[PDB]
Amino acid sequence: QDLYLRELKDTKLAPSTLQDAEGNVKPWNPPQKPNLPELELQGPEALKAYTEQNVETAHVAKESEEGESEPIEEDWLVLDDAEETKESH
Amino acid sequence: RIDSVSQLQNVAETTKVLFDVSKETVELESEAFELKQKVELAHEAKAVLDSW
């Protein structure tokens, strides 16, 4: 069907200079290559956070420590305050 | 006074086990903290790749 044929040939070929050969675009007055693959290519890193979330920050955890190796001057206080609790107990 | 004596009979024998096993269950979960690091980095990766 040459209706279908000529329709599909113009359908294929009229944007084929926008897809097959990159002679960017004749009817569109703004250029097409600085829309999606140049501006909007960094789109998702213009739409999400840059240099922390997309670079993802493989980050070292803060090494949380013990009671800093001091028994004496606080274990005696814990012992005497425990005497005071057992007074109150 | 015999009763208040008899309550504390076997208690020190049990709280020398209470002490150890309780502090072990406290401090064997910084393992899970350094697991959480591996969790949250993969969560960030899943979030950004979902954005992709």
Of A19, A56, A21, A71, which is closest to residue B38 (Cα–Cα)?
A56
- Cβ–Cβ contact B47 with A under 8 A: yes
Of A19, A32, A22, which is closest to residue A11 (Cα–Cα)?
A19
| CA dist list (Å): A56 to A46, B33, B38, B40, B51 | 15, 19, 12, 10, 13
Query: Do residue B48 and residue A64 have CB atoms under 8 angstroms apart?
Result: no
H/E run at residue B31 = helix B30-51
- Cβ–Cβ contact A48 with B under 8 A: yes
Stated in angstroms to one decimal place, the resolution of this structure is: 3.8
Of A50, A52, A53, A30, which is closest to residue A42 (Cα–Cα)?
A50
Contacts of A61 in chain B (CB under 8 A): 33-34, 37
Top residue of B11, B15, B48 to mutate, by most chain A CBs within 10 Å, is B48
Exposure on the CB side of residue B31, measured as CA atoms within 13 A = 6
Of B37, B44, B51, the CB nearest to A44: B51
In this structure, how many other beta carbons lie within 10 angstroms of the beta carbon of residue A27?
Answer: 7
Alpha carbon B8 to its chain's center = 27
Q: How was this structure determined?
A: cryo-EM
Query: Do residue A53 and residue B34 have CB atoms under 8 angstroms apart?
Result: no
Q: Annotate chain A with DSSP letters as a single string.
A: -HHHHHHHHHHHHTTHHHHTS----SS-SS-STTTTTTTTTSSHHHHS-TTTTSS----PPP----STT--HHHHHHHHHHHHHHHHH-
